[PDB]
């Protein structure tokens, strides 16, 4: 009898996960309005309160300017549809500066430093109709049947 | 202020993010009976609940 | 000779939730960090690194 040993590697990232500890900025004084937000997808601002201070956000839509990307949290997120979502009427962790892992639906790896283009639903796509100030950071990987991309967000 | 004109209670732990409370109601009746009686009215109870964040 | 490293994050609310529910979240991340270091060492031995010669 011959003894045997095995080996297996973990995955690199998860959707909506913060990439690395470089200089980042999280805007936690936000509230979800009119729908559900998927972690790892861009969000927009519909109203910034002049006195109260909170910002009202929802999923991205055609002809709108994105603001940031929601991130993972084991306390502020509800587990629905076999994944993490941000439910309507709750506080959301929105990142507006730094490197983040983001949902994607393209097929080819991007080039470093080029501009990011988004789809109507708020996911990265190489030929999207939405223009962003963001750039590509070089990370490009795949969780189980899920594509992910590393994106660098600059403060609006 | 709202903290002086309304009651303040301390029953919820700092880790809970949702809570639930219940109220109960009763149903039944009674009747004038005689000895050697078999049919006696029955009673029952029920409850309802509400949530908070 | 070369150096290796990573890190992890955790918030106060998660710490309290782990202390209350009985399943902490920090020890899992520490184990993941150690496993990542060991697997990186194994991968360097058995696959190399072209940029680092």
């Amino acid at each position: 009898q011959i003894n045997a040993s095995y080996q297996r590697d973990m995955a690199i990232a998860l959707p909506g996960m913060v990439a690395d500890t470089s200089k980042y900025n999280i805007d936690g004084a936000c509230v979800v309005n009119e729908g559900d937000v998927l972690v790892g997808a861009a969000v927009q601002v519909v109203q910034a309160q002049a006195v109260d201070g909170h910002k009202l956000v929802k999923a991205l839509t055609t002809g709108t300017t994105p603001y940031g990307v929601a991130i993972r949290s084991h306390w502020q997120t509800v587990n629905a549809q076999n994944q993490m979502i941000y439910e309507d009427g709750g506080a959301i962790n929105v990142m507006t500066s730094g490197r983040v892992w983001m949902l994607s639906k393209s097929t080819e790896a991007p080039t470093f430093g080029s501009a990011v283009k988004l789809d109507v639903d708020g996911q990265e796509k190489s030929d999207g109709t939405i223009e962003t100030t963001w750039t590509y950071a070089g990370g490009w990987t795949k969780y189980k049947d899920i594509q992910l991309v590393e994106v660098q967000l600059h403060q609006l | 202020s709202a903290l002086r004109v309304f009651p303040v209670t301390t029953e919820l732990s700092p880790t809970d993010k949702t809570f639930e409370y219940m109220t109960f109601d009763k149903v039944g009746t009674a009747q004038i009976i005689a000895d050697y009686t078999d049919d006696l009215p029955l009673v029952d109870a029920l409850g309802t609940s509400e949530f908070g964040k | 000779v070369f150096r290796l490293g990573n890190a992890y994050l955790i918030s106060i609310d998660e710490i309290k939730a782990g202390q209350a529910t009985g399943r902490p979240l920090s020890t899992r991340k520490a184990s993941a960090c150690q496993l990542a270091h060991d697997q990186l060492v194994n991968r360097l031995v058995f696959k190399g690194s072209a940029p680092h010669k």
């Binding site: 297996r8 | - | 496993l35 194994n42």
Partner: peptide, 24 residues
């Protein structure tokens, strides 16, 4: 419309199961 809820008649097993990643 009852007196007890499902959560009051539930039990969570003490032991959990962990995925395995051999080092090599």
């Amino acid at each position: 419309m009852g007196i007890w809820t499902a959560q009051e008649l539930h039990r969570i097993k003490s032991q959990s199961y962990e995925e395995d990643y051999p080092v090599g």
